[PDB]
């Protein structure tokens, strides 16, 4: 019944399809954003695969950019 912070160092650090299958499972409901909204589901994403929280809330911020850069709107909200 723990989590157990432990890993390892590395130049250049890469997910496989198996972790991002995770991963981008969750961004199908809207895990795009980092504050408490979207964080109570990524402490699961991050203690089912067991990887610091910050290595997953940095891949959502990440992302969006990686869409920016073709012009998408992923900006947030959609109108209020």
């Known amino acids: 019944g723990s989590s157990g912070s432990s890993g390892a160092l590395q130049d250049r650090t890469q997910f496989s399809d198996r972790d991002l299958a995770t991963l981008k499972k969750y961004w199908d409901n809207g895990m795009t954003s980092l504050g408490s909204v979207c964080r109570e589901k990524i402490e699961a994403v991050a ?5 610091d929280c ?7 911020g ?3 950019r990686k869409y920016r850069l073709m012009g998408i709107e992923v900006s947030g909200p959609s109108s209020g």
């Open 62 to 64: 990440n992302r969006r």
């Open 54 to 60: 910050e290595i997953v809330r940095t891949w959502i």
């Open 47 to 51: 203690t089912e695969l067991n990887v």
